[PDB]
Symmetry: C2
C-alpha cells in the first residue's frame, strides 16, 4: 500500500485514494475491514493517526472519517 | 496490529509474534498474504524495512526471512 496521507491532505481525500488502490485488488468485505483497521490508520498523517488510534477496536470507516474531518 | 519489530529483535522472532496475533483472528490464506505484504513489512524495524521494500511485489515470507536473517 503506497498510499499515505499527506500532512495537509483532508482525511476523506486520503480515504478515496486508499480505496482506489484497494478496489484494484477486488478485496472482499473481510479484507476491506482488515485494511481499514490496519493500513488506513497506520498510513494516516501524524495528527490523524493519533486520533484514530484513540478510537479503539471496531471503529468504523464512518467513525474514522468523523474523527478526522476537515 | 500492535506487534512491531524491535530495532535489535531478530526478524524470525518478530515474525512469530506477528503470526501469533494473526492466528488469533483465524485469518485465511488471502488475509495472511495481505498482512505479509503490508503490516509485516510496514512494522519491521528501520534496517529490515528498507531491505524488505527492495524485494518488490509478491516476495514470500520465506524470501523476507532470508533477506533479514540474523
Amino acid at each position: 500500500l503506497d498510499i499515505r496521507q499527506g500532512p495537509k491532505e483532508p482525511f476523506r481525500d486520503y480515504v478515496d485514494r486508499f480505496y482506489k488502490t484497494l478496489r484494484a485488488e477486488q478485496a472482499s468485505q473481510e479484507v476491506k475491514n482488515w485494511m481499514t483497521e490496519t493500513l488506513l490508520v497506520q498510513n494516516a498523517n501524524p495528527d490523524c493517526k493519533t486520533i484514530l488510534k484513540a478510537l479503539g477496536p471496531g471503529a468504523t470507516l464512518e467513525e474514522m472519517m468523523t474523527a478526522c474531518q476537515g
